[PDB]
Amino acid sequence: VKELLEAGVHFGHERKRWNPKFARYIYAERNGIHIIDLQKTMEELERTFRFIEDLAMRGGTILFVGTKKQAQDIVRMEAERAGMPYVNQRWLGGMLTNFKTISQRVHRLEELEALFASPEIEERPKKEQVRLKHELERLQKYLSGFRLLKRLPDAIFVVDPTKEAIAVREARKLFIPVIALADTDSDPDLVDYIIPGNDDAIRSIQLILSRAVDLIIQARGGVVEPSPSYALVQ
RNA sequence: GAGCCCUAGCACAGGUGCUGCAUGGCCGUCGUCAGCUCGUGCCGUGAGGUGUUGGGUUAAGUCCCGCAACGAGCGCAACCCCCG
Ligand SMILES: [Mg+2]
Ligand SMILES: [Mg+2]
Ligand SMILES: [Mg+2]
Ligand SMILES: [Mg+2]
Numbered sequence: 001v002k003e004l005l006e007a008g009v010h011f012g013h014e015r016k017r018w019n020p021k022f023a024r025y026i027y028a029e030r031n032g033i034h035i036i037d038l039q040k041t042m043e044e045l046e047r048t049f050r051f052i053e054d055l056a057m058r059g060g061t062i063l064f065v066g067t068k069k070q071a072q073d074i075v076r077m078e079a080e081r082a083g084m085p086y087v088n089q090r091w092l093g094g095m096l097t098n099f100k101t102i103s104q105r106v107h108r109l110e111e112l113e114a115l116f117a118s119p120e121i122e123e124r125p126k127k128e129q130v131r132l133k134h135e136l137e138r139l140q141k142y143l144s145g146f147r148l149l150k151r152l153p154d155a156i157f158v159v160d161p162t163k164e165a166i167a168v169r170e171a172r173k174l175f176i177p178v179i180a181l182a183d184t185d186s187d188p189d190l191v192d193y194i195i196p197g198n199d200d201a202i203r204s205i206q207l208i209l210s211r212a213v214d215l216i217i218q219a220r221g222g223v224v225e226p227s228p229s230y231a232l233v234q
Numbered sequence: 235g236a237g238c239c240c241u242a243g244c245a246c247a248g249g250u251g252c253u254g255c256a257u258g259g260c261c262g263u264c265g266u267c268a269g270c271u272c273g274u275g276c277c278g279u280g281a282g283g284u285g286u287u288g289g290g291u292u293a294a295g296u297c298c299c300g301c302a303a304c305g306a307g308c309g310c311a312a313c314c315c316c317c318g
Binding site: 094127 | 285
């Protein structure tokens with residue numbers, strides 16, 4: 001189910017904060033706003049999903065990023081709802097590019113997995129039960145979706161690339177294909193497979209980002225429900 | 235002419251004689267001041283920068299939140315002694 005499902009509540013977004021490189025994917029300045037030509041949305045979807053498919057059934061790992069305010073959660077849903085890695089709270093200087101080092105944080109996160117369930121089940125110089133169980137605190141918060149990922153992904157999926165630029169940069173540096181949902185905010189030129197959409201409305205992120213995860217599990221057989229995601233959707 | 239010890243020579247001893255501006259070691263000092271760095275990534279043609287900066291907080295670069303950085307090292311703290 002696609003087509004008018006998109007016009008559902010998810011077409012055009014921002015106005016007069018545009019990138020004129022995005023002028024190709026626009027329908028009009030109707031009532032002050034940029035409303036985004038959907039025929040070409042759909043157009044780009046086929047090519048993009050086509051890439052996802054092939055990538056997925058060839059057994060690839062996509063890396064999902066959405067640190068954005070109201071995308072935050074509907075990421076770690078569909079990301080985990082497909083066993084793919086995700087970056088949720090904040091992108092870090094050189095997850096990809098400084099990958100080896102940023103990994104020793106995960107290498108050392110699960111050292112503390114294995115100190116919870118431990119012979120030190122309740123022991124070690126008692127003020128070290130915040131000193132270390134608050135190290136695992138931060139480690140937890142950030143590397144929760146990143147922890148799976150043990151070689152660079154074969155792709156990345158991004159919700160707002162002008163928001164998420166520090167990532168996309170690393171991607172392109174590393175020849176890693178950039179998949180993203182992008183609106184009039186953004187610079188198409190450096191998004192390899194674009195979902196000309198709406199970086200913002202939670203429904204729009206949902207419709208799109210879930211289907212893409214359908215396609216992913218569905219390209220290893222075993223489709224499920226209407227997705228464990230409708231947040232407080234409101 | 236084994237050792238030892240004497241006098242005559244010999245190779246050497248000795249020197250608190252100079253150079254702390256040839257030096258080691260040890261000390262003083264800014265100063266127990268909250269600092270000085272490195273590894274990798276990143277930015278810059280480059281010297282270099284980021285990190286360490288910022289907002290809150292500490293006796294402290296002490297910790298917190300934030301952030302193209304993420305972590306480490308010598309410091310600080312703690313591990314030692316005395317007094318309750
Ligand atoms: Mg001297
Ligand atoms: Mg000297
Ligand atoms: Mg003198
Ligand atoms: Mg002198």
